Design a protein around this ligand. Structure first.
Ligand code: NDP
Ligand code: SF4
Ligand code: ZN
Lengths: 331, 117, 170, 123, 68, 483, 80
């Protein structure tokens, strides 16, 4: 059981705290990094703090609900994972949750508006609210994540607000490190494969030709942890794109050739498409978003001036290699 | 009160809990690890938690010091600490104390100090 | 959005909507509290005590506990007895085919942190390393009184589930 | 318990190195024949020739043992692991012991020189 | 349970004939300090937290330079 | 007093240091700290006894240790990345560039033979044999031969002191330096009938001394006075010399008299033993003199630019240049760490698989009782990486390859704990005579005491608070007085 | 730069080297006052000279050899 996490043993952090990873790196060992992951119950967060607590970094987990917080205890030893509740609203809870954190990330992004939160709330406002306290506490290695196609421009209010949040993270505590991953695929992803696994309709616009290169989620998590600890990451925008660009027809045919089923196809245009998604907001379980409509006409706008996987010595995998595994139990 | 959390950030607990005891503020061991070291160690699992409902177990070094120093008529004292109500064998075992030197002498189990007079 | 907001541990109903949601939450948590179906996992010296709860001194039917020994009908699982290396994938698999409003409770001292077999070779050092356990029942013969008390502790946690109040995202 | 299980044999000790070699050759043929059954049964992520190139190199590990009887205990252990894998007796968690290196590419800073050993004082 | 006083908790589980309101004061354990009665606060933020009572084994050395 | 309890303990047989005899000890350790030391029995070297300072030294072994590398900012040290320290070493090497006779390498009192091998290899692959001891008047050769091991060792057996007849100390307190030796002296003096002379400092022995003087001229008067007859008469005498005279610049004529006398008397210099017997204050300067840890006459001249501290507490601000690069490598915080630019936490004598040579010459293994705590490492492993960030390639990476390199320096150090005699008596004494012959002009400097106090030396008696409170109670006190 | 060599203190196969260091050191130290000798012994070795140069690079030779001048031939060879 070795530290494949770190480069070394003894690390002073940027803020000047001394960290000595005693023991041999396993679950019982201690590394010393006090980390905080906002929104860790989310799909990226589980795989993230799994590898983050695999080497015994103390992970402060803020949660929102008391039920989904429980299945992240198993990836840490005693004192490794800890839990505390908070709202995005109450600033004192933000203030409290990051007091001893060496490092901290925020994967807070919600693809639909609630009746209590919009995109302007949870992307540009709350990120300001938390990284203000990061600036107040001189917390080292602050990482912010935004999505792909995070512009200043209109047509997706989500994507309109993601770049606003990026500019706010560049504004205050200005050395903050920004990462933009690709679309993601994993076992039970949010809307990209399990929506394509079972679907009574399978309708969307564009005639299925928006382009991107999806990344396996565990590669994003390993990439993030390899970011987390070294130098040469500070204040650098990070495009994290898969090995080869796809189209939706290519993706869905690759899914259906392993399912050996007729995945349905409707592909009706935008007008009748919008008003059906309008009525789904009143339902408490999450449905396809009326602003997810807009991103279907959008595609992967890659910034060339960023730093890839091969910056940090990693090669992610290709989706055709994984297609038998992930939608295996729907056979 | 405000102690440095290894980063220049200060953590702020009330003076009712910068205490070794409700009876004593100061440490009594070479490796006692005062509470000012302890919150400095892991406040990580102390946030969002009450400060009142931890033990604070009424440390003994203050309680033993205000017991009256007894007197012994002869030379050699005996200490048991056993009650005379309890039907059994309690207290510390029957060791004896020489009290000859100037000053009292604590029985090394019970801590009661005896004096020859 | 308000910069100050009360914690969900500290909040009180003030809107009439909140009275409605809190009473509906109480009905849901209440039916979850009364009807209470664990699964017979027990395997060792920590399983006879599980049967001692079914005995006519410390009844569980008066509590609504009944052992539907079929994990698809089970609300929770009682990990009881020691946990070996050879078994542990079966423990994970039995945890897998359970419905979503689930818990699991660690009856027995071997079941948390190894217990008396903490230094054996073919043993899991407590069922923390497999399933996320919410209540531990200590005691190496973990007392029927203590096991029931662990259930009442879990039922207090069930009273504080807030499945309805979180739709308002409090 | 008069009768055995399906593939279990009475253990018997070959007197010659050649008879041991004959049994090992038949044994590798048995693994190699039952290998596509394993990927179905243990539901593994990866492909059948990876199983085959492990089963080859595991016998490559013990190609160069001199003794008759140490190869005899080695053959008996191999036959028992065949006996386990041909049934449901191992489970897929225990079946995937044999590929630690395949499932995860190791991680950043695998120590190679003296210095990478030294900076983490040999892990 | 465990919201009851100890000297009662014995009698509730039938340890004694004589409930502690009727015991003689000779069987009262004399104490030189007041009593507080924390029942249990599991899950409540008044839950017990652990820590090692003693300091680290080896103290470091403080940096004291010496201008030659 | 009550810290542990003898079934909890892990025991480990090992070697004492901060003592010239290197007594065979046992370390009781709980597993992180070091609980106590108890002398394991051995016939020759200690007869199941141990020094007092050897006993209570475990306090400083756990209270002031270097746990991380600290780099000077300028009147301030901050701890830093373990790369950053050694990268600063390479960077400031490229800044200063000592091309030769400007890389001072000094080792200390309790330092490893195996570590000083790495030291000498690094310095002379670097291209400078500025390789000097910690002692004042250590900046030259120690006024006698590094050749002919007899020049720096104890040539009789320690077992031969039972057979001793009549000896004389010069410039030493053998009650202080190697008190185990004093136990042997008093046992001999009670058992047989002996005669001791003492030249130099007036000490309080347990036994009966006979003082002679406080001058090398008084010494030279005493050699030709009456004991030129006695030591010629005596069957198995010896003559015993402390290391404090190495401090005196007039050591060589101080050798040249006594080196004549051993040459002149064939009773003190026969085949089966040799009467010239010297001691050290350390457990390591004997091992260092096996290494060849001496500067040249050319290397004694140039003020360095890059001073290497390896232990070596008793340097002064006078012994160091102004702008010098002074990277300390040690275990605790002493004067040597106070002057430093970068400190390097190296393991102490407990944590490492040490190898030590006493004044008798016994090569002895120090089995490691625990791991190096915090961020300390083993010493020669640090020197390997320090070589790697320079152009120096040390040809080893393991312990066995060090053992073979150490066998290359001297095969008597891999052949452990077996005392050989020297077949070169007369040639060795003569070659010790010819070197410092005549050129040393002995002054009338009085033979003052070698050490200030016994219980305050060697960076651990100063580290341990128990030896501070030992030191205060032990000078002319009314409870420590006799009458 | 330095030089060392090692004998065995038993009188076997190091005796010409033994008498070489009995005699030739008073001439060799004067012949090379810059570099340095040192002698050690370990109860049985092969008689062997190790010398270190002006690099830290060293060289070696094994002295199963006849007489003192036969030692000196190998020594003079080993210096250059
Ligand atoms: N392919 C994709 O899905 C892409 C996603 N991203 C971004 O990566 C991050 C994680 O990805 P993913 O796992 O898919 O999405 P998530 O499921 O993680 O998004 C929701 C997470 O953030 C929390 N969250 C949202 N709003 C709030 C709020 N007001 N208060 C507290 N928590 C809140 C959620 O809390 P709770 O746990 O209670 O639900 C949950 O933890 C997201 O920020 C996403 O925008 C970027 C590029 C690709
Ligand atoms: S709790 Fe006690 S009885 Fe049960 S498995 Fe553990 S040791 Fe056995
Ligand atoms: Zn007593």
């Amino acid at each position: 059981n070795s530290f494949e996490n770190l480069a070394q043993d003894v690390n002073i952090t940027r803020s000047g705290k001394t960290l000595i990873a005693k023991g041999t790196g396993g679950r019982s060992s201690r590394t010393g990094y006090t980390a905080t992951v906002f929104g860790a119950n989310g799909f990226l967060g589980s795989y993230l703090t799994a590898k983050l607590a695999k080497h015994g970094t103390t992970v402060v987990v803020p949660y929102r609900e008391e039920m989904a917080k429980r299945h992240l205890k198993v990836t840490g030893d005693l004192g490794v994972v800890n839990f505390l509740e908070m709202d995005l609203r109450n600033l004192e809870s933000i203030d409290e949750a990051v007091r001893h954190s060496d490092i901290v990330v925020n994967l807070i992004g919600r693809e639909y508006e609630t009746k209590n939160f919009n995109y302007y709330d949870v992307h540009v406002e709350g990120a300001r609210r938390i990284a203000e306290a990061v600036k107040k506490h001189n917390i080292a290695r602050y990482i912010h994540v935004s999505a792909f196609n995070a512009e200043i421009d209109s047509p997706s209010e989500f994507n309109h607000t993601k770049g606003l949040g990026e500019q706010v993270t560049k504004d205050i505590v200005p050395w903050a490190t920004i990462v933009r991953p690709a679309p993601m695929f994993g076992r039970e992803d949010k809307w990209f494969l399990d929506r394509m696994a079972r679907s009574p309709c399978l309708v969307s616009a564009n005639k299925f030709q928006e382009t991107s290169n999806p990344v396996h989620v565990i590669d994003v998590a390993a990439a993030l942890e390899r970011i987390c600890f070294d130098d040469s990451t500070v204040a650098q925008t990070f495009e994290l794109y898969g090995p080869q660009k796809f189209t939706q027809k290519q993706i869905i045919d690759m899914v259906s050739e392993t399912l050996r089923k007729e995945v349905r196809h409707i592909e009706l245009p935008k007008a009748l498409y919008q008003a059906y998604t309008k009525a789904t907001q009143a339902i408490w379980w999450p449905t396809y978003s009326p602003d997810q409509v807009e991103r279907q006409f959008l595609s992967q706008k890659i910034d060339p001036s960023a730093k890839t996987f091969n910056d940090l010595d990693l090669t992610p995998m290709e989706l055709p290699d994984l297609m038998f595994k992930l939608i295996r139990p729907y056979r | 009160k405000s102690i440095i959390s290894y980063n220049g950030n200060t953590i702020e607990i009330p003076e009712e809990y910068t205490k070794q005891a409700p009876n004593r503020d100061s440490t009594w061991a070479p490796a006692q690890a005062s509470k000012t070291e302890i919150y400095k160690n892991n406040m990580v699992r102390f946030e969002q938690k009450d400060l009142s409902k931890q033990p604070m177990p009424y440390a003994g070094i203050e309680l033993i010091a205000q017991q009256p120093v007894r007197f012994v008529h002869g030379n050699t004292a005996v200490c048991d600490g056993a009650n005379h109500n309890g039907p059994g064998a309690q207290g510390h075992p029957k060791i004896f104390i020489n009290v000859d030197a100037p000053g009292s002498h604590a029985c090394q189990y019970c801590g009661t100090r005896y004096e020859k007079e | 959005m308000p910069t100050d907001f009360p914690l969900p541990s500290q909040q009180k109903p003030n809107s009439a909507v909140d009275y409605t949601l809190t009473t509906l939450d109480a009905v849901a948590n209440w039916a979850r509290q009364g009807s209470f179906w664990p699964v017979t996992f027990g395997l060792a010296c920590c399983a006879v005590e599980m049967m001692h709860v079914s005995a006519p001194r410390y009844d569980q039917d008066r509590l609504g506990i009944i052992f539907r020994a079929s994990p698809r009908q089970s609300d929770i699982m009682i990990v009881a007895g020691t946990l070996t290396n050879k078994m542990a994938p079966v423990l994970r698999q039995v945890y897998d085919q359970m419905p979503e409003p689930r818990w699991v409770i660690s009856m027995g001292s071997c079941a948390n942190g190894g217990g008396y077999y903490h230094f054996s070779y073919s043993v899991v050092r407590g069922c923390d390393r497999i399933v996320p356990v919410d209540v531990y029942v200590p005691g190496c013969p973990p007392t029927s009184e203590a096991l029931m008390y662990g259930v009442f502790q879990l039922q207090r946690k069930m009273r504080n589930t807030k499945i309805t109040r979180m739709w308002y995202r409090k | 318990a008069i009768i055995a299980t399906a593939f279990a044999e009475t253990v018997k000790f070959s007197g010659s190195k050649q008879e041991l070699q004959k049994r090992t050759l038949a044994l590798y043929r048995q693994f190699l024949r039952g290998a596509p059954t394993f990927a179905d049964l243990y539901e593994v992520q990866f492909s059948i020739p990876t199983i085959r190139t492990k089963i080859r190199q595991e016998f490559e590990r013990h190609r160069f043992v001199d003794d008759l009887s140490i190869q005899n205990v080695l053959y008996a252990k191999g036959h028992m692991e065949y006996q386990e894998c041909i049934n449901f007796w191992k489970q897929q968690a225990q079946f995937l012991k044999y590929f630690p290196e395949e499932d995860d590419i190791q991680g950043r800073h695998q120590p190679s020189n003296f210095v990478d050993k030294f900076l983490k004082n040999r892990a | 349970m465990s919201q009851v006083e100890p000297g009662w908790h014995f009698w509730l589980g039938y340890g004694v004939d004589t409930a502690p309101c009727n015991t003689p004061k000779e069987k009262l354990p004399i104490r030189a300090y007041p009593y507080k009665f924390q029942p249990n606060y599991t899950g409540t933020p008044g839950a017990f937290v652990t820590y090692n009572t003693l300091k680290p084994k080896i103290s470091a050395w403080e940096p004291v330079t010496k201008q030659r | 007093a009550f810290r542990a309890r003898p079934w909890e303990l892990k025991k480990t047989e090992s070697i004492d240091v901060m003592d010239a005899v290197g007594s065979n000890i046992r370390i009781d350790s709980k597993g992180v700290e070091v609980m106590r030391v108890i002398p394991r029995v051995h016939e020759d070297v200690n007869e199941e006894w141990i020094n007092d300072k050897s006993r209570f030294a475990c306090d400083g072994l756990k209270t002031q240790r270097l746990t991380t590398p600290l780099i000077r900012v300028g009147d301030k040290f901050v701890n830093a990345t373990w790369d950053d320290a050694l990268s600063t070493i390479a960077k400031a090497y490229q800044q200063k560039a000592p091309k030769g006779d400007e890389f001072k390498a000094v080792a200390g009192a309790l330092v490893e033979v195996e570590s000083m091998v790495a030291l000498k290899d690094m310095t002379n692959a670097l291209g400078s044999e500025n390789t000097t001891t910690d002692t004042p008047n250590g900046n030259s050769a120690p006024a006698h031969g590094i050749t002919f091991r007899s020049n720096y060792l104890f040539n009789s057996s320690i077992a031969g002191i039972e057979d001793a007849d009549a000896i004389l100390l010069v410039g030493t307190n053998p009650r202080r330096e190697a008190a185990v030796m004093n136990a042997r002296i008093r046992k001999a003096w009670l058992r047989q009938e002996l005669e001791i002379a003492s030249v130099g400092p007036t000490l309080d022995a347990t036994f009966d001394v006979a003082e002679l003087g406080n001058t090398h001229a008084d010494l030279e008067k005493a050699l030709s006075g009456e004991f030129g007859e006695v030591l010629k008469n005596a069957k198995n005498p010896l003559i015993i010399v402390g290391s404090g005279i190495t401090d005196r610049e007039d050591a060589g004529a101080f050798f040249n008299t006594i080196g004549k006398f051993v040459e002149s008397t064939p009773s003190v210099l026969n085949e089966n033993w040799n009467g010239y017997n010297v001691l050290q204050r350390s457990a390591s300067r004997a091992g260092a003199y096996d290494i060849g840890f001496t500067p040249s006459d050319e290397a004694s001249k140039t003020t360095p630019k890059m001073v290497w501290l390896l232990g070596a507490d008793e340097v002064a601000a006078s012994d160091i240049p102004a702008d010098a690069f002074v990277v300390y490598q040690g275990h605790n915080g002493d004067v040597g760490a106070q002057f430093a630019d970068v400190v390097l936490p190296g393991a102490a004598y407990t944590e490492k698989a040490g190898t030590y040579v006493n004044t008798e010459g016994r090569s002895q293994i120090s089995r490691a009782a625990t791991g190096p705590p915090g961020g300390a490492r083993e010493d020669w492993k640090i020197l390997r990486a320090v070589s790697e960030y320079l152009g120096v390639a040390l040809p080893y990476e393991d312990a066995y390859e060090v053992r073979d390199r150490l066998a290359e320096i001297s095969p008597s150090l891999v052949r452990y704990d077996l005392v050989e005699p020297t077949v070169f008596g007369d040639v060795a004494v003569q070659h010790s005579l010819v070197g410092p012959n005549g050129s040393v002009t002995p002054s009338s400097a009085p033979l003052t005491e070698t050490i200030e106090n016994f219980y305050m030396t060697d960076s651990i008696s100063r580290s341990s608070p128990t030896m501070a409170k030992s030191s205060i109670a032990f000078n002319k006190d009314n409870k420590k007085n006799q009458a | 730069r330095e030089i060392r060599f090692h004998l065995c203190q038993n009188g076997s196969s190091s005796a010409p080297l033994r008498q070489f260091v009995k005699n030739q050191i008073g001439a060799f130290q004067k012949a090379n006052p810059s570099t340095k000798v040192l002698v050690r012994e370990a109860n049985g070795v092969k008689p062997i000279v190790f010398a270190r140069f002006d690099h830290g690079h060293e060289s070696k030779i094994g002295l199963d050899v006849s007489s003192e001048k036969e030692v000196a031939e190998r020594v003079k060879s080993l210096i250059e």
